[PDB]
Each structure stands twice: as structure tokens, then as C-alpha cells.
Amino acid sequence: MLFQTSYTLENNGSVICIPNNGQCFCLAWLKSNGTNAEKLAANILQWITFALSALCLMFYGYCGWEEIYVATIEMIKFIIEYFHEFDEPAVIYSSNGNKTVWLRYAEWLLTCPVILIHLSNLTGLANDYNKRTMGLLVSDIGTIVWGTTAALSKGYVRVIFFLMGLCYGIYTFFNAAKVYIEAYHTVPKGRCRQVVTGMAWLFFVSWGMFPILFILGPEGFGVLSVYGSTVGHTIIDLMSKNCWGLLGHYLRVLIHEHILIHGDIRKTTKLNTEIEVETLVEDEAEAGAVSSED
Amino acid sequence: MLFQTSYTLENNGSVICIPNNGQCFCLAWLKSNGTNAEKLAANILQWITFALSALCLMFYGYCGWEEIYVATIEMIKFIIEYFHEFDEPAVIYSSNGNKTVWLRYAEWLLTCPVILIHLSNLTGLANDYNKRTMGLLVSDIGTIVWGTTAALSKGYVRVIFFLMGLCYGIYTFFNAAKVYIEAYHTVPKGRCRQVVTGMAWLFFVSWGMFPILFILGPEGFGVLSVYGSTVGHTIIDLMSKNCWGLLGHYLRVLIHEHILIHGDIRKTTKLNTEIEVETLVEDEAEAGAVSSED
Ligand SMILES: CCCCCCCC/C=C/CCCCCCCC(=O)OC[C@H](O)CO
Ligand SMILES: CCCCCCCC/C=C/CCCCCCCC(=O)OC[C@H](O)CO
Ligand SMILES: *C/C=C(C)/C=C/C=C(C)/C=C/C1=C(C)CCCC1(C)C
Ligand SMILES: *C/C=C(C)/C=C/C=C(C)/C=C/C1=C(C)CCCC1(C)C
């Protein structure tokens, strides 16, 4: 540690004395991060993630910028974890006694908006983004900022900022859901609709797990230890980023093959909220005005 | 303060003893935030900003969501400053001795992307955003994340993260410049082109001042004190947000009046990098294919 770890209790445990060496001191910081079993598990999941993220980068290496940016950051993340995981400021040890994993929240700020940009162009064919895309990004940034602030805070201040994060988060989840519904009815009828369905399940489950891990972790009720929280977070990271990004590359190849073999043939379908989506079709026998009541 | 402020030096200044009351302690945290003159100046500029931001909200209150979101956050910001400016986590007092103004960086994360979204639709007429818009947002988020990490860090770690912020920042500034060039040649020939020119000056000067205030502040070489840094930051805040947002509302009204009186009549002008922009014109005697060599 690069904070004070050696001290003496004096006067029946009522006074703590430390070397006057310029280092900060706090008992709360010295609480254990967890068991050796938790530590072993965390280093394994990290290695798996560093390696798999590096494989994904090379694999994608065989437009497309979103999968690479996230996979690059995940890799960079491990080297910092690997060398300085518990060094400030990968973990912030603050005057109120909290341990805040800035690396995680910073990583979310780097990667989550890019995932949402990817989500807004699942097929990869669009060159533009609507107004709703922008709201998705702004709501998500706020979620992380409130969540980070909550983690840095204590008591009632933590609770309030968490709840604003929850309000921002619901708005994010709701609009993400809207995007996936449009995407499902946009992509061709076969395999493309299977992949999109898989991504929705992956997305809502993995992203939905995050507020839960927060509540359980040191940032909430301290059920999970620091290592415990790391293991959980790396799991849902693999889901939310690596696996989801894999599917996204796969989905985009499938969309590309469809347009190469069949060309870009569109049919307008309307979904009655009442939304309209231009579905990709396979042959020119369809170019009509189809609908679908929900 | 809610950290330890009372201590005794023992053994010829080599041992510090504190009450064992659970509070964290560090000498670095107790350094003064600055002179009383600096404090007075900071409270004045904050009040000016709280009031003026509230005026802007009501004033805009007489599409348009970007001016309100930023002005709302600025207002909320002051109430937190007003009640808990130097309470954790508005300022983070970390184990490495740094004081990091999380409120500022968090505020930047909330407001700067929205300013850039506004910038990407200065006229307010567009319903879509290109790929380049998305890069603008992603580069800017990275800047803040690296800058925040640099502020939280020390020594060579601070320097590296600052430089990545600088690389991200240049990419942001460059693309912002691209947007303003397109915007200038898009808006009508008269007053609209004056306002856009004003915004470019405001934008690059106020945003450009931020890395400079960083280098001078406690986050860098400690030339400026904490209060000193606050005063500077509130000034360029008024420029980057309040004044710029004012012009943006004004610019959008002017664009709206043009389309109401004259309708939406466009002419394609091409700018030889070679870029094409559809300029708004006043009468149907222009609908041609004009160009302009740079
Ligand atoms: C994400 C979109 C779908 C929403 C589903 C969300 C997942 C579960 C959240 C649940 C209830 C909120 C719980 C609020 C309590 C949190 C307060 C806290 O963290 O505890 C602080 C306290 O000071 C320490 O003792
Ligand atoms: C923003 C786009 C246009 C670019 C214009 C930028 C404005 C000026 C930046 C300049 C040089 C960079 C200076 C790099 C030195 C910073 C390192 C530092 O902060 O000092 C840490 C040290 O450890 C404490 O003693
Ligand atoms: C790669 C990392 C990802 C996809 C992280 C996602 C994180 C979230 C969806 C976090 C959500 C939260 C809330 C819904 C409420 C406030 C607490 C948070 C930040 C954990
Ligand atoms: C309302 C707040 C605004 C507009 C803040 C803008 C901040 C910046 C443009 C900061 C830029 C930085 C760099 C260019 C390099 C790294 C250090 C920063 C974060 C100060």
C-alpha cells in the first residue's frame, strides 16, 4: 500500500500514532478485500478476459470501429489492473473511508456509450442516428455519473444519487428496448432475427445485473467483498461487451452477406405507440406497405 | 471538515497521534484552499452563475432540450456547491493526498456531450447526426475520463493520462472546428453567419482554457489555489455554457424566422479535404450547384 499501514493504539485504544512520513492513514482502508479464494477467482477471470478480448480484437482484425474500441479498452484495462489494481487511482481510498473502483466507472464511461452507439446501428448500414439515439447516450452517461457519485458517497447522499441513477437507468433500458424492437423487425426474417433476439437477452440481463451488484457490493450494503465484486463484474463484463460484441460482428457479417447476394431491397412495415420500420426483404416481390399490430 | 483535523506532533515531529474516532487523517488535506479574497470572488461568481443560469432557463422557457439540460445541471451544481462544496465527494480527499474536484469533472460529463450534440445541430433543423458526430462525443468523453484520472493521480501517472486527454482533446477540437466550418456555410448569409462566428470564438477560447487551468491548478503544478481554480473555472463555464447556450437559442430563433418567412430553400455548395454542404438561401432564384475553393 501507498497509504499508512503501520500504527500503534495508545491510551486504551483511544489514540492512534503514525510515523510522520507524509502518508495518509485510515482504519477503514485496511479492511480486507476478501479471501484468497476470491483473489484466485478474480485473477483467473481477468486473465480469461484479457486473453479473450485480445482474441476478439485479432479476430475482428481478419465501420466495425465499435467492436474494436471496446475490445481495446478492455485490454488496456487489464494491464492497469495487472500492475496497479489496488493502487490509487484504480481504487480511490477517500477521506470518508470509502474504497471506490474508479477504474470500473471510468471504463464504463469509455465503453458503454460506444456499445449504445453500436446498438443504434446494429445492422451497420445506417449512416445517421436519430434524436432518440442521443437521449440514450445522455441518459446512460448520467447513470454512470450518479452511480459513481453514489459509490463515492455514504448514507443518505449515496441513496439519493443511486436513485437518480436508477431513474436515468430505467430511461436507458426503456429506450434500448425500443431500439431492439425496431432492430428485430428491420433485419431479415431468418438467422438475423435470432441473433438480435440473443443480444436483447444478453443486453438486458448483463446490464440489469449492474445495479444489483452495486447494491450488494461495498458501494451498497457490503454483502460482497471487493474481490467478490470484481469476480461478478468481470463475468457480466464478458456478457455485456465481449460476447455481445462478438454477436454484433457476426450480425453485421450476416447483414452484409444478405445485401451482397440479394441487394438492398426494402419494404415499409408499420408497428402500431405507432412506429414505422423499413424491413429488409429478400426479393423484389415485396416492396409494399405491410403492418403489424402489437 | 469530516476528516481528522486535530493532531499532536510527538517525538520531535516524527509521530502524529489522533483520536481513534474512525476518521481518516492526512496533512496534505489540511493545506489551505486559498485567501479570503479568493473565497469572496468564488462565492460571487457562483451566485452570478446560479442566478444567470436560472434566468437562462426561465428565459428559454418563454427541440430546444440542449439549452435547458445544461442550464438545469448548472443550477443543480450550485446548490451542491452551496451546501457541500468541500464535502466529500464534491471534493475527493484521497489517500495519495490529492484534492480532486469530482463535482467539476462529473458536471463536465453531464454537460459537455450535450453541448457537442447542440453543436452538431446548430440550426436545429436536422433530425439526424452523422458518424462524425459520434466520434466527437466519444473523443470528448475520453478526454474528461483521462483528465479526471490525471487529476486523481500524481507524478508520471498524472502526466501520461493528461497527455492522452490532450490527444483526445485535440481530436475533439479538430472535429468541432470541422462542424463550425460546415455550419458557417450552411446558415443564411447575414446575421446567422455572425452568430456562428461568435460561437466558434467563444467555443475554442473557453474550451481551450480548460487544459491550461488544469496545468496551473492543484491538479498540475499548483500555481493556482483551490479557490483560484474555482474562480477561473466559473468564468470559462459562463462562456462555454451560459453565453454559448444563449447564442444557440438566439441562432435557432433566427434560423426559424428565416424558414417561416422564406421557407426551406436549399442550394448545394461544395467546399474543396473536399466537403459538401447544403446552404440555406432566401429565394428560389438560387437552387444551383455552387462551390468554394479553400
Ligand atoms: C436498471 C433498470 C431496471 C431497474 C432494476 C434495478 C435493479 C435492482 C435495483 C433495485 C431497488 C433500488 C434499491 C435502492 C437502495 C440503494 C441504497 C444503497 O445503495 O444503500 C446505501 C446505504 O446508505 C448503505 O447502507
Ligand atoms: C486542447 C487542444 C489544443 C491543445 C492546447 C493545450 C493547452 C495547453 C496544454 C499544453 C502542453 C501540455 C503540458 C503537459 C504537462 C502536464 C503534466 C502535469 O500536469 O504535471 C504533472 C506533474 O507531475 C506535476 O508536477
Ligand atoms: C461494460 C460495462 C457496462 C455495460 C456497465 C453497465 C452499467 C450499468 C447499466 C449500471 C447501472 C446502474 C444503475 C441502473 C443505477 C445506478 C447504479 C448503476 C450505475 C450500477
Ligand atoms: C462546461 C464545461 C466544459 C465545456 C469543459 C470542458 C473541458 C475541457 C475541454 C477539458 C480538456 C482537457 C484537455 C484538452 C486535456 C486533458 C485535461 C482536460 C480534461 C482539462
Author numbering:
A (entry chain A), B (entry chain A): 50 to 111, 118 to 295, 296A, 297 to 327, 331 to 352
What did the published study say regarding this structure?
The first crystal structure of a channelrhodopsin has been solved for a chimera between Channelrhodopsin-1 and Channelrhodopsin-2 from C. reinhardtii commonly known as C1C2.4 This chimera with transmembrane helices (TM) 1–5 from ChR1 and 6–7 from ChR2 is more stable in detergent than the parental ChRs and provided the first invaluable insight into the overall architecture of the central ion conducting core. It shares the prototypical seven-transmembrane helical fold of microbial ion pumps and human G protein-coupled receptors. A first constriction of the putative channel, called the central gate which is composed of residues Glu129, Asn297 and Ser102, is found close to the retinal Schiff base and its counterion residues Glu162 and Asp292 (Channelrhodopsin-2 numbering can be obtained by subtracting 39 from the C1C2 residue numbers).
For our room temperature analysis of light-induced conformational changes in C1C2 we purified recombinant C1C2 from insect cells and grew crystals in lipidic mesophases following established conditions and subjected them to serial synchrotron crystallography at the Swiss Light Source, where they diffracted with anisotropic resolution up to 2.6 Å. To elucidate the conformational changes required to fully open the channel, we performed atomistic molecular dynamics (MD) simulations starting from the light-activated structure. As a further control, we performed the same simulations starting from the dark state structure. Even though the central gate and extracellular vestibule in the light-activated structure were more open compared to the dark-state structure, the changes were not sufficient to allow K+ permeation.
